[PDB]
């Protein structure tokens, strides 16, 4: 999809294998913000998006938190607390064509600004001078879009397919995880558990705390877990720390 109408399909309820993406070499830029591209296989996200688009000409590096320009301010703006990865690679041999695939729009001018992670397909005529023009491209009223131009003659101006994976790992019970083979759970022993990304060490016991059908884990006064609803059985286990003390 063109950058002014970037696609996005929310990925969930599946096993995410970021190994098949991290080791591939065709990707030109693989930059991750808030996460490391080598530790994506051991994490569990509540929802992972995939914003795919094509950005040729300049602004190949404007897809990043805290950047300005004609693309990052009028087409696709990322937040400042962005958590995810930004993958890019020039697709000159798929999105070029023998003549010109003038098929990608980029939305010049827009109005005054654009909020993060917002999209707008409205093609209403933009007026920079006087107001009178209503849906008519007049003297000082331009059609807002303006298409892209693709040809080898233009490296710093050839299309770069971009896929912006945006992970949100605090919004819900973790539904998309990495390729980690589950093991049997053992109770009454100090173990280093891993409940879909919830890493930690402790001794798991049976509990009497009657979880409600929607609650998935209990929490302490601090940001430490007290009880967990174990997957694959929906059982409520208590996490007590295995004994310690001075000597």
């Amino acid at each position: 999809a063109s950058v002014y109408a970037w696609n996005r399909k929310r990925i969930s309820n599946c096993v995410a294998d970021y190994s098949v993406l991290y080791n591939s070499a065709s990707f030109s830029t693989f930059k991750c913000y808030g996460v490391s591209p080598t530790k994506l296989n051991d994490l569990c996200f509540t929802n992972v998006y995939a914003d795919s688009f094509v950005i040729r000409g300049d602004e190949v590096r404007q897809i990043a938190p805290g950047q300005t320009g004609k693309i990052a301010d009028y087409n696709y703006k990322l937040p400042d607390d962005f958590t995810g990865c930004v993958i890019a690679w020039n697709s000159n041999n798929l999105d070029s064509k023998v003549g010109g695939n003038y098929n990608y729009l980029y939305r010049l001018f827009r109005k005054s600004n654009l909020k993060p992670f917002e999209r707008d397909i409205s093609t209403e005529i933009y007026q920079a001078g006087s107001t009178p023009c209503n849906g008519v491209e007049g003297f000082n009223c331009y059609f807002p879009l303006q298409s892209y131009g693709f040809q080898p003659t233009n490296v710093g101006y050839q299309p770069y397919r971009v896929v912006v994976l945006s992970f949100e790992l605090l919004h819900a019970p973790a539904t998309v995880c990495g390729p980690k083979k589950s093991t049997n759970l053992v109770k009454n022993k100090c173990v280093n558990f891993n409940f879909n990304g919830l890493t930690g060490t402790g001794v798991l016991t049976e509990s009497n705390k009657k979880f409600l059908p929607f609650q998935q884990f209990g929490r302490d006064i601090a940001d430490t877990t007290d009880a967990v609803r174990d997957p694959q059985t929906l059982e409520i286990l208590d996490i007590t720390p295995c004994s310690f003390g001075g000597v």
Partner: antibody, heavy 129, light 108 residues
Framework: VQLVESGGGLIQPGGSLRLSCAASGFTVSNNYMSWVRQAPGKGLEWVSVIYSGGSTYYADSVKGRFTISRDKSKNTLYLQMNRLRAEDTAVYYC?????????????????????????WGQGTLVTVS | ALTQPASVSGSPGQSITISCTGTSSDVGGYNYVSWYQQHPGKAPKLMIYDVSNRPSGVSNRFSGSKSGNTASLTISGLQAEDEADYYCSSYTSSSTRVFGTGTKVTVL
């Protein structure tokens, strides 16, 4: 990428012939190199293949008679033909295999396999009589 | 070895399928079936590789597939230039490569 061949011609049965395939734009060690012949007006028969290093693999019709070699310094591919026979009359092509990550597939990274044939040589006539 | 129909024929505009039956070792076992096009007096040209994919720079009408021990080259929209023989080269099954007998296509 260029592949030029030389060395073929008229020869008697039982003799010896060494073929040449000079490769510019790539090496005899970057990607797998293979020899393939085509009898006059007939199909294609794979003769032999040398891997990027340490392979002397041939066909059952040419085992013990042909040996494939290369010179890294001159960047040429060689094919010794000893004890030629009348059924070896064909035009011989030196075929470079697929470079790693050919056509830039982004799903399979750098696994060499990519077993196919990239651009070929021009071919030289070998007439055993 | 690999068996192919000695010749196929068709009219411009429609599609033609090309078969190549082999054993379960290379075509039925492995997945590196390829296809080539050789005009008389020219060196062959890579038409299909990976037995699903197609090399860039080639007309998109070409298409390939394999059902078990049988490979298939499904050319669509025949033109006048398509007149040439097509060889199906599967994987080798331990480095003894194989080729088909060849299918000389004739366009009406």
């Amino acid at each position: 990428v260029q592949l030029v061949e030389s060395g073929g011609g008229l020869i008697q049965p039982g003799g010896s012939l060494r073929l040449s395939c000079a490769a510019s734009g790539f090496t005899v060690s970057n990607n797998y190199m293979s020899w393939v012949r085509q009898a006059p007006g007939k199909g294609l028969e794979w003769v032999s293949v040398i891997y990027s290093g340490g392979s002397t693999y041939y066909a059952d019709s040419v085992k013990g008679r042909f040996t494939i070699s290369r010179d890294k310094s001159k960047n040429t591919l060689y094919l010794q033909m000893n004890r030629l026979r009348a059924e070896d009359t064909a035009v011989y092509y030196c075929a470079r295999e697929g470079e790693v990550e050919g056509y830039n597939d982004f799903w399979s990274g750098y696994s060499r396999d990519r077993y196919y044939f990239d651009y070929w040589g021009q071919g030289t006539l070998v007439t055993v009589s | 070895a690999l068996t192919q129909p000695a010749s196929v024929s068709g009219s411009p505009g429609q599609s033609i399928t090309i078969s190549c039956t082999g054993t379960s070792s290379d075509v039925g076992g492995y997945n590196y079936v390829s296809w080539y096009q050789q005009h008389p007096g020219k060196a062959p040209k890579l038409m299909i590789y990976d037995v699903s994919n197609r090399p860039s720079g080639v007309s998109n009408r070409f298409s390939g597939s394999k059902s078990g021990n049988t490979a298939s080259l499904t050319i669509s929209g025949l033109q006048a230039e398509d007149e040439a023989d097509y060889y199906c080269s599967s994987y080798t099954s331990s480095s003894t490569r194989v080729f088909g007998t060849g299918t000389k296509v004739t366009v009406l």
